[PDB]
Design a protein around this ligand. Structure first.
Ligand code: SF4
Ligand SMILES: [Cl-]
Ligand SMILES: [Fe+3]
Length: 178
């Protein structure tokens, strides 16, 4: 069984075309502000209710956001896709692997593998590094392949799923304004 970190509902929709027996873990203290976290969480809950998915919701709090910010802050000034995102994704995947170990899952993954903007080699390297640390296997898949991304777009539209326009953190929201 696999515990799959969930970044957002659109990428969850792409992912569920391929995976069938999973526990999902919505944990994203990198999403600010709270209103945006809740909007994204509610979209995930809408997908989970529609398809009867098993989703666990992680901690979101001032303390949790401060732990994330500490992990990325020395690279604030670098763009998206830089060492800042390496730190951010490792932070999220480390917590996911910890949860997988605690809940008895032998494997972990992330719906970030389905996101068209993310760097697959970077994510696979992070996942394998965390696998070696925790002893939970990282499951890699080109989750966009088999045309699954466009499959996720179609289901997002039909179900009326919120599709965000910035990665999630305050740095990415500023970079949106340019
Ligand atoms: S742009 Fe996305 S991956 Fe990069 S630090 Fe911000 S939330 Fe994390
Ligand atoms: Cl995302
Ligand atoms: Fe996503």
């Amino acid at each position: 069984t696999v515990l799959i970190h969930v970044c957002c509902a659109p990428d969850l929709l792409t992912t569920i075309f391929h995976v069938r027996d999973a526990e999902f873990f919505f944990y994203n203290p990198n999403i600010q502000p709270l209103s945006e976290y809740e909007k994204r969480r509610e979209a995930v809950d809408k997908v989970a209710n529609h398809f009867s998915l098993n989703v666990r919701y992680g901690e979101y709090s001032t303390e949790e956001i401060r732990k994330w910010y500490t992990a990325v802050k020395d690279y604030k000034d670098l763009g998206e896709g830089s060492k800042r995102c390496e730190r951010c994704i490792s932070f999220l995947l480390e917590r996911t692997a910890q949860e997988a170990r605690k809940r008895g899952h032998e494997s972990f993954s992330t719906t970030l593998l389905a996101s068209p903007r993310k760097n697959l080699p970077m994510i696979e390297n992070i996942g394998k590094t965390i696998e070696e640390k925790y002893g939970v296997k990282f499951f890699f898949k080109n989750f966009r392949k088999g045309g699954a991304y466009q499959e996720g777009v179609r289901l997002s539209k039909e179900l009326g799923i919120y599709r965000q326009n910035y990665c999630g953190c305050v740095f990415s929201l500023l970079e949106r304004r340019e």
